[PDB]
Amino acid sequence: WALEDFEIGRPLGKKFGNVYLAREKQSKFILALKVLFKAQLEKAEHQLRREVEIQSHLRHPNILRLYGYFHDATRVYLILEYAPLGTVYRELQKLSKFDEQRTATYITELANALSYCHSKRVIHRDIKPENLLLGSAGELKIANFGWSVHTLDYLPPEMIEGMHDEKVDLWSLGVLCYEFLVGKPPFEANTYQETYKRISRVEFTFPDFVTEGARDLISRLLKHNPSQRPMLREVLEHPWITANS
Numbered sequence: 001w002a003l004e005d006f007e008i009g010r011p012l013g014k015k016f017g018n019v020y021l022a023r024e025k026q027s028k029f030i031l032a033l034k035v036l037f038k039a040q041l042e043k044a045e046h047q048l049r050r051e052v053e054i055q056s057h058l059r060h061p062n063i064l065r066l067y068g069y070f071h072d073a074t075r076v077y078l079i080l081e082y083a084p085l086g087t088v089y090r091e092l093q094k095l096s097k098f099d100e101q102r103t104a105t106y107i108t109e110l111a112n113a114l115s116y117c118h119s120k121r122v123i124h125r126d127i128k129p130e131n132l133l134l135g136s137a138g139e140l141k142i143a144n145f146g147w148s149v150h151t152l153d154y155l156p157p158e159m160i161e162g163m164h165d166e167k168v169d170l171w172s173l174g175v176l177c178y179e180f181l182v183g184k185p186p187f188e189a190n191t192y193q194e195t196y197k198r199i200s201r202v203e204f205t206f207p208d209f210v211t212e213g214a215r216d217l218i219s220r221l222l223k224h225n226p227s228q229r230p231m232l233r234e235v236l237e238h239p240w241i242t243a244n245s
């Protein structure tokens with residue numbers, strides 16, 4: 001592949017990452033081209049190989065496809081799937097808060113994607129609104145596996161205790177579900193030392209509108225001990241989820 005093999009379009013967003021809307025000059029295939037600068041990649045490397053390898057190989061309608069990649073003298077290019085509706089982060093800022101049906105639905109799609117990921121021993125470890133995209137029909141799509149392996153408010157007590165490998169994505173899930181329905185992370189604070197303390201002792205409360213069913217699921221996902229969090233299968237079969245998704 002060569003940069004010459006694509007027509008460049010308008011910019012879709014942006015670190016060293018300038019992501020642009022592009023179209024393969026051969027079949028007009030619309031996709032997103034992420035550009036990464038080597039100087040800025042070295043300056044701060046393999047953290048990127050980590051991605052490419054992982055994501056290239058994944059394949060779930062709810063996981064952003066990495067069709068391939070290539071390099072130049074100073075420019076590395078990741079050829080990704082194009083997500084028409086932008087990020088869930090922006091959507092949440094626009095709606096301020098999601099209803100139970102949208103939330104349940106996003107959680108369902110996200111658990112199906114993670115289930116798929118975990119069945120392949122791949123853990124995202126960086127699930128948050130900014131890393132979730134929406135496809136042409138509003139289908140949630142997990143992206144940026146740069147932290148994946150084989151955000152402060154969304155990190156589990158096991159990543160702040162002193163980093164682990166398997167029920168950290170369930171914690172992030174329970175956090176995300178809360179932020180979806182309430183409009184703000186459950187441990188949000190003005191300070192680092194307090195969001196750290198609040199997460200360390202799992203100190204959070206629910207407004208008064210968050211329903212019982214949601215409270216139940218979130219409470220189960222935000223357990224201090226990993227083993228005590230539910231399996232993705234339990235999430236999918238939770239009453240609140242099946243009744244609202």
Ligand SMILES: Nc1ncnc2c1ncn2[C@@H]1O[C@H](COP(=O)(O)OP(=O)(O)OP(=O)(O)O)[C@@H](O)[C@H]1O
Binds near residue numbers: 013130
């Ligand atoms: N596949 C995609 N579909 C839609 N637009 C996207 C896609 N990837 C990136 N964009 C947009 O471009 C922005 C920048 O992309 P991205 O966050 O990956 O850049 P970055 O600074 O390189 O981040 P990271 O450190 O995770 O690699 C995103 O926040 C998003 O709005």
